[PDB]
Amino acid sequence: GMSTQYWEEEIEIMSREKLQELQLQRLKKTINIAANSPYYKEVFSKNGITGDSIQSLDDIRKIPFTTKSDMRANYPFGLVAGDMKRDGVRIHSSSGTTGNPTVIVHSQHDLDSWANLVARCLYMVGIRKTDVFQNSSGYGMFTGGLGFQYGAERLGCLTVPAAAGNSKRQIKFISDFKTTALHAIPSYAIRLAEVFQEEGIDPRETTLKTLVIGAEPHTDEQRRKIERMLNVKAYNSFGMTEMNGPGVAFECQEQNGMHFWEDCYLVEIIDPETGEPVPEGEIGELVLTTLDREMMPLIRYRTRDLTRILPGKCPCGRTHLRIDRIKGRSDDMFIIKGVNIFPMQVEKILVQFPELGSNYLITLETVNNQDEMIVEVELSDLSTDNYIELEKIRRDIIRQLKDEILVTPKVKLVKKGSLPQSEAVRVKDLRDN
Amino acid sequence: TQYWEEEIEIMSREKLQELQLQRLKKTINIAANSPYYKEVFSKNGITGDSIQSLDDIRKIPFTTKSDMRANYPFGLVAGDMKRDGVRIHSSSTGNPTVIVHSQHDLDSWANLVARCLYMVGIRKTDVFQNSSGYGMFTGGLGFQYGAERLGCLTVPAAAGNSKRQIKFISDFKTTALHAIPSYAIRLAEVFQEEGIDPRETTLKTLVIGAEPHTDEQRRKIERMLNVKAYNSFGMTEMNGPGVAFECQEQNGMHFWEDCYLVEIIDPETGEPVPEGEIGELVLTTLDREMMPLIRYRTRDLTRILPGKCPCGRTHLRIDRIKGRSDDMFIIKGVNIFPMQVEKILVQFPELGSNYLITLETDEMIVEVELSDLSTDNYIELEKIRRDIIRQLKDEILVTPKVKLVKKGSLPQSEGKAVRVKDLR
Ligand SMILES: Nc1ncnc2c1ncn2[C@@H]1O[C@H](COP(=O)(O)O)[C@@H](O)[C@H]1O
Numbered sequence: 021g022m023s024t025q026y027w028e029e030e031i032e033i034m035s036r037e038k039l040q041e042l043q044l045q046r047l048k049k050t051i052n053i054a055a056n057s058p059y060y061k062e063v064f065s066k067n068g069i070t071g072d073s074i075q076s077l078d079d080i081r082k083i084p085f086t087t088k089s090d091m092r093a094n095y096p097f098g099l100v101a102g103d104m105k106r107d108g109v110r111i112h113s114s115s116g117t118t119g120n121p122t123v124i125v126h127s128q129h130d131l132d133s134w135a136n137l138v139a140r141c142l143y144m145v146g147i148r149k150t151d152v153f154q155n156s157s158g159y160g161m162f163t164g165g166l167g168f169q170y171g172a173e174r175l176g177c178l179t180v181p182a183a184a185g186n187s188k189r190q191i192k193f194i195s196d197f198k199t200t201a202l203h204a205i206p207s208y209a210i211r212l213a214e215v216f217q218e219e220g221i222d223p224r225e226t227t228l229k230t231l232v233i234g235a236e237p238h239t240d241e242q243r244r245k246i247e248r249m250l251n252v253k254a255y256n257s258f259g260m261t262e263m264n265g266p267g268v269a270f271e272c273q274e275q276n277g278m279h280f281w282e283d284c285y286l287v288e289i290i291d292p293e294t295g296e297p298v299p300e301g302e303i304g305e306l307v308l309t310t311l312d313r314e315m316m317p318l319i320r321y322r323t324r325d326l327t328r329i330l331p332g333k334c335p336c337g338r339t340h341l342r343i344d345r346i347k348g349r350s351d352d353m354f355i356i357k358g359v360n361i362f363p364m365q366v367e368k369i370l371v372q373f374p375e376l377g378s379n380y381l382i383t384l385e386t387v388n389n390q391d392e393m394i395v396e397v398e399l400s401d402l403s404t405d406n407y408i409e410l411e412k413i414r415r416d417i418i419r420q421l422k423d424e425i426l427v428t429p430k431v432k433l434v435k436k437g438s439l440p441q442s443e444a445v446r447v448k449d450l451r452d453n
Numbered sequence: 454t455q456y457w458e459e460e461i462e463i464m465s466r467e468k469l470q471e472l473q474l475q476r477l478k479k480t481i482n483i484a485a486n487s488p489y490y491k492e493v494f495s496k497n498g499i500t501g502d503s504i505q506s507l508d509d510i511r512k513i514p515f516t517t518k519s520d521m522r523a524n525y526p527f528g529l530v531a532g533d534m535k536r537d538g539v540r541i542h543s544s545s546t547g548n549p550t551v552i553v554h555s556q557h558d559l560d561s562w563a564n565l566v567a568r569c570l571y572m573v574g575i576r577k578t579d580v581f582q583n584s585s586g587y588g589m590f591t592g593g594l595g596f597q598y599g600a601e602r603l604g605c606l607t608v609p610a611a612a613g614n615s616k617r618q619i620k621f622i623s624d625f626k627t628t629a630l631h632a633i634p635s636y637a638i639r640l641a642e643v644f645q646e647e648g649i650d651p652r653e654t655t656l657k658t659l660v661i662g663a664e665p666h667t668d669e670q671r672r673k674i675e676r677m678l679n680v681k682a683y684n685s686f687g688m689t690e691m692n693g694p695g696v697a698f699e700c701q702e703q704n705g706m707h708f709w710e711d712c713y714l715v716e717i718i719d720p721e722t723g724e725p726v727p728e729g730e731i732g733e734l735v736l737t738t739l740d741r742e743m744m745p746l747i748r749y750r751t752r753d754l755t756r757i758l759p760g761k762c763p764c765g766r767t768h769l770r771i772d773r774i775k776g777r778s779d780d781m782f783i784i785k786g787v788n789i790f791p792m793q794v795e796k797i798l799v800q801f802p803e804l805g806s807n808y809l810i811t812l813e814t815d816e817m818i819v820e821v822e823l824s825d826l827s828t829d830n831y832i833e834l835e836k837i838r839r840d841i842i843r844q845l846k847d848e849i850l851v852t853p854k855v856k857l858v859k860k861g862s863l864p865q866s867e868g869k870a871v872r873v874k875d876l877r
């Protein structure tokens with residue numbers, strides 16, 4: 021409380037009364053901006069949403085939800101509200117070519133707001149400009165790459181844009197550049213600790229002090245295991261491309277719930293069936309509204325993420341609400357190696373091969389603390405192909421899947437009728453979650 | 454002609470010389486704080502009074518890749534890295550060299566990339582796609598920050614996944630693309646495979662670099678995609694992209710002399726070459742503060758093109774990179790550069806764009822893919838193959854073995870194309 025340091029004290033410890041008037045002011049502004057987009061112009065016209073519709077924060081429930089299906093239907097720029105040709109500076113797109121992906125368009129204001137939120141998060145968990153920050157997240161279209169890169173530079177850290185994989189090079193950068201802060205997915209942080217002891221280095225005797233872990237569900241125990249293996253303090257990091265990427269919700273040094281930055285987001289916990297707000301503190305679907313986005317704001321977006329608001333004041337002194345861990349989702353999406361994948365993306369690739377049967381199964385397992393994706397697909401007795409030709413097709417399946425879902429899966433061609441029958445195709449998740 | 458920074462881009466030679474001298478003295482005073490240049494200046498008697506003219510830089514010895522490897526990782530860091538260091542980049546076997554940047558250094562680098570892009574006609578209204586690898590590769594974050602500084606709608610596609618690259622161009626209406634010359638050809642091929650005419654896209658401008666390539670190789674890219682392609686020079690040591698770049702005249706790459714001091718030195722004597730002769734490119738940073746580099750031997754061979762450019766810019770122009778010193782190969786005691794082979798192969802329209810030089814025990818094998826548009830028979834193609842052997846023999850002064858291979862048979866590299874395979 022008294023010894024707690026803040027990036028933006030006036031906002032981070034702002035009274036609930038002053039937070040409510042800030043959210044209402046930014047909510048009205050967001051709706052007036054969003055009304056310029058072809059999608060929300062249509063939505064507001066059909067539901068009688070005008071400039072007088074929002075007088076309180078509860079009036080947001082007059083506006084219907086924004087679903088992923090709606091966003092896919094308006095791909096690529098149906099929800100763009102600003103002047104993209106003049107002020108649009110970046111596009112963040114989701115994976116795929118078999119279906120319409122998700123596109124978020126940002127202006128310079130939007131990138132600066134996002135970079136400030138990431139800097140706020142990093143400063144909160146004790147990271148300073150004197151720290152050496154290494155980002156093991158994939159770059160390019162992945163928001164974790166450029167997101168933490170801009171945020172850590174804004175804070176003033178000596179950044180190490182290592183990007184994904186090559187654990188020996190990751191260990192080399194930590195040892196030679198004296199890395200103190202590291203961003204990694206929980207399973208990769210365990211892999212790095214393992215690679216340290218393979219190279220004859222004690223994973224507890226490095227320059228590492230702080231770890232930022234996210235992109236996928238993990239228990240408090242899995243985080244405590246990471247903390248013991250590397251002799252560090254690990255903090256839960258929440259984000260999604262739709263909400264910028266990282267910097268949305270983050271743990272404080274109390275490591276009890278993730279503080280949601282309510283100055284930039286309006287949080288709603290809704291019953292996934294009725295679509296009504298859940299009783300205070302119960303598990304429901306996370307529904308979010310951007311409050312500082314201008315190029316492409318999102319109003320009441322159904323994230324399909326399940327969580328709850330943790331009650332009571334936090335001893336760090338911050339007034340921004342805390343959410344519990346995200347354990348699962350209300351949709352059919354699965355996360356492997358921190359990458360979001362829909363089972364339809366896999367099916368749309370497999371159906372193109374006439375040598376394959378219709379029956380397929382996706383299995384998610386943990387092998388040596390690392391997550392693996394196994395795609396079993398039955399053979400069609402219609403093919404006249406021998407071993408050499410079928411193996412070439414199996415390698416072509418791996419390659420086309422890798423390009424679509426942005427992860428390399430294990431593909432096994434199984435006997436016709438070997439896989440069990442159910443009748444939508446299920447994803448068998450055998451991981452400890 | 455439109456300029457990003459007119460006052461600097463058309464600045465008189467007299468005013469450029471006093472700007473370079475002012476920034477050279479500042480660079481040497483900053484570099485003196487690094488453990489490496491503190492020792493170098495102490496042993497060679499380099500003080501604050503040693504530099505009074507631009508010619509006085511020759512009092513300071515050269516900085517080689519070996520000196521940088523010997524002082525890896527932060528032996529040449531001059532600034533306060535803990536307080537002002539904001540990024541570490543690395544260059545593409547052994548111990549990769551590291552460059553440390555402050556916020557000033559990143560902003561200077563971003564401004565140079567924006568200056569380059571604006572010069573070739575790219576504006577904030579353009580949709581810029583970067584197919585360069587991100588992470589530690591300077592091409593990724595280098596063009597990303599530069600294009601955002603200009604105000605382009607950026608598409609950080611990163612390396613590979615050609616089907617997704619084509620999808621982004623088609624759906625986001627990409628007008629400007631950054632790619633290595635060999636990957637630009639691969640994308641044009643993938644467009645045709647997906648039933649799209651590579652000449653009927655929204656693409657208008659292409660930025661190509663990293664790989665040594667001929668003018669005809671670039672003209673092939675321009676015809677395949679119906680675009681204007683511009684040569685982009687850079688290296689991690691000098692920030693990455695934005696160092697040297699062609700103007701709309703497409704005749705020599707303008708070197709930004711406000712941020713770099715250019716020298717063309719004889720690799721044997723270590724003295725400046727006669728005005729306009731081919732020699733080793735030796736560079737000094739003039740706007741870098743965290744880790745400046747003084748008279749760095751790049752290993753790149755080029756020459757300064759004489760005369761003022763019709764675009765009105767007063768900044769000197771360098772010719773195409775002949776190749777790096779490590780690219781040179783010796784067969785039967787004769788020195789050969791891979792660009793000598795490419796400059797011959799590009800003149801034959803019956804040949805493709807992908808080729809491979811193999812050295813075995815000594816024999817030199819030159820594999821080159823056939824064109825898809827080729828309708829020639831065996832007798833005519835064999836006559837062309839014999840014409841290729843003759844023209845190669847006269848140029849490289851050794852008789853090589855030439856094999857005409859199937860289109861797509863030769864392997865495509867993940868990054869820069871490997872043109873020489875030495876199996877000796
Ligand atoms: N800290 C976290 N804990 C659990 N799941 C997370 C976390 N951060 C992100 N996710 C999940 O990843 C999704 C965002 O993925 P993406 O759009 O690729 O950044 C979220 O909607 C969550 O389902």
Ligand SMILES: Nc1ncnc2c1ncn2[C@@H]1O[C@H](COP(=O)(O)O)[C@@H](O)[C@H]1O
Pocket residue numbers: 544545591661662663664665666684685686687688689690751753774776777
């Ligand atoms: N436009 C270009 N033409 C030819 N070679 C280039 C070009 N740009 C860069 N290079 C080469 O690539 C090197 C820089 O590589 P890197 O620092 O790994 O990006 C230079 O020193 C040159 O040898």
Ligand SMILES: [K+]
Pocket residue numbers: 149150151176177178534535536537538539
């Ligand atoms: K720093």
Ligand SMILES: [K+]
Pocket residue numbers: 235236355358359360
């Ligand atoms: K994720």
Ligand SMILES: [K+]
Pocket residue numbers: 104105106107108109577578579604605606
């Ligand atoms: K723009």
Ligand SMILES: [Zn+2]
Pocket residue numbers: 272273274279334335336337338
């Ligand atoms: Zn707290």
Ligand SMILES: [Zn+2]
Pocket residue numbers: 700701702707762763764765766
């Ligand atoms: Zn010019």
